[PDB]
C-alpha cells in the first residue's frame, strides 16, 4: 500500500582537476525508472522502465533540463566544500544528495526528504517538519544559515508535499502492472555437511519484489542468532531480489530449526523445516 519516489545523485571529483562525475537515478519503491550518467556520456534523462517511456517529449525535455541544472549545482558544491574544509583540488571528493517523498496506504503525503553527504558522512538534512535543518558539523552550519535566510525549506516543502506526491501517484497509476505488484518469494532449504559434527541449513528466498524481506531462524520456537549468517538482499537483475539466511547446527539436530519468511507478497508468513 505504502510507496516512495527517490532521486539519488552522486558527484565525484576525481584525483586532479578533471571534470567531475555526475550520476542521477530515480526510483519508485525498488524500481529504477530514470538515469543520467556523465561516465556513460548521457545527454538526456533516459528511461529505464517501459511505463515511463510513455511520457511525451515535453516530459523528457523538462527532466533533461532539470538534471543538467542539478549537474551544474553539484559542480559548484564540490568547489564550495573544498573551500569550507580547506582542501586542495588534488584529492577526490564525493557529494551525495537524496530527495523524495513517501505516501501511506491512502496515497497521501507521509514524509519528505532532502539531504546531503560529503566524503561518506552526513553533511546536512531537511528535518521531518520540512522547516528546519540538521547540520552534521560546523561547515554545514554555514549551509544551514544560508538556506534559512533564503527560505529553501519552504520551497522544498511545496515540491515534497505537492509535485513529488502528485507525480508519484501518476507513476503508480501509469506503471500499475510493474509498481503495484508483489512477487512472493520462492523459498527452499538446502543442507551441507560442514563435517561429521555440523551441517549448514541455508534458507532461500528468490524472485521477490519488493526488496523488503525478513528471514529469521528459530530453534524449538525460540529466536536464534548464534552461528547464524544473513547476506544483504541482492538484485537478480530482472527487477526481482534474492536473499538467504544460514545456521550451522549440530549433526542430528536439524529438525529443531525453522526458517521464518515475511514478505508483503505472501498470504501469510512461511515456516520452513529441514525434511529427510
Amino acid at each position: 500500500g505504502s510507496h516512495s519516489m527517490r532521486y539519488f545523485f552522486t558527484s565525484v571529483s576525481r584525483p586532479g582537476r578533471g571534470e567531475p562525475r555526475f550520476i542521477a537515478v530515480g526510483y519508485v519503491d525498488d524500481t529504477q525508472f530514470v538515469r543520467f550518467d556523465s561516465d556513460a556520456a548521457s545527454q538526456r534523462m533516459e528511461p529505464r522502465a517501459p511505463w515511463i517511456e510513455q511520457e511525451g517529449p515535453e516530459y523528457w525535455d523538462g527532466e533533461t533540463r532539470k538534471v543538467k541544472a542539478h549537474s551544474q549545482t553539484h559542480r559548484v558544491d564540490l568547489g564550495t566544500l573544498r573551500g569550507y574544509y580547506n582542501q586542495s583540488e588534488a584529492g577526490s571528493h564525493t557529494v551525495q544528495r537524496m530527495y523524495g517523498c513517501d505516501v501511506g496506504s491512502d496515497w497521501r503525503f507521509l514524509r519528505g526528504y532532502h539531504q546531503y553527504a560529503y566524503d561518506g558522512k552526513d553533511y546536512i538534512a531537511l528535518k521531518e517538519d520540512l522547516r528546519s535543518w540538521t547540520a552534521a558539523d560546523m561547515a554545514a552550519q554555514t549551509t544551514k544559515h544560508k538556506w534559512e535566510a533564503a527560505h529553501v525549506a519552504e520551497q522544498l516543502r511545496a515540491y515534497l508535499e505537492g509535485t513529488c506526491v502528485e507525480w508519484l501517484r501518476r507513476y503508480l497509476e501509469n506503471g500499475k502492472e510493474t509498481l503495484q505488484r508483489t512477487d512472493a518469494p520462492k523459498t527452499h532449504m538446502t543442507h551441507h555437511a560442514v563435517s561429521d559434527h555440523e551441517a549448514t541449513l541455508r534458507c532461500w528466498a528468490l524472485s521477490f519484489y519488493p526488496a523488503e524481506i525478513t528471514l529469521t531462524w528459530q530453534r524449538d520456537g525460540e529466536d536464534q542468532t548464534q552461528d547464524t549468517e544473513l547476506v544483504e538482499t541482492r538484485p537478480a537483475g530482472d527487477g526481482t531480489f534474492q536473499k538467504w539466511a544460514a545456521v550451522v547446527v549440530p549433526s542430528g539436530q536439524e529438525q529443531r530449526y525453522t526458517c521464518h519468511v515475511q514478505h508483503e507478497g505472501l498470504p501469510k508468513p512461511l515456516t520452513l523445516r529441514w525434511e529427510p
Binding site: 530515480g26 527532466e63 544560508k146 520551497q155 522544498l156 515540491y159
Partner: peptide, 9 residues
C-alpha cells in the same frame, strides 16, 4: 519528476 529549483551548499 525532478525538483525544479536550484539549491547550492
Amino acid at each position: 519528476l525532478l525538483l525544479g529549483i536550484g539549491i547550492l551548499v
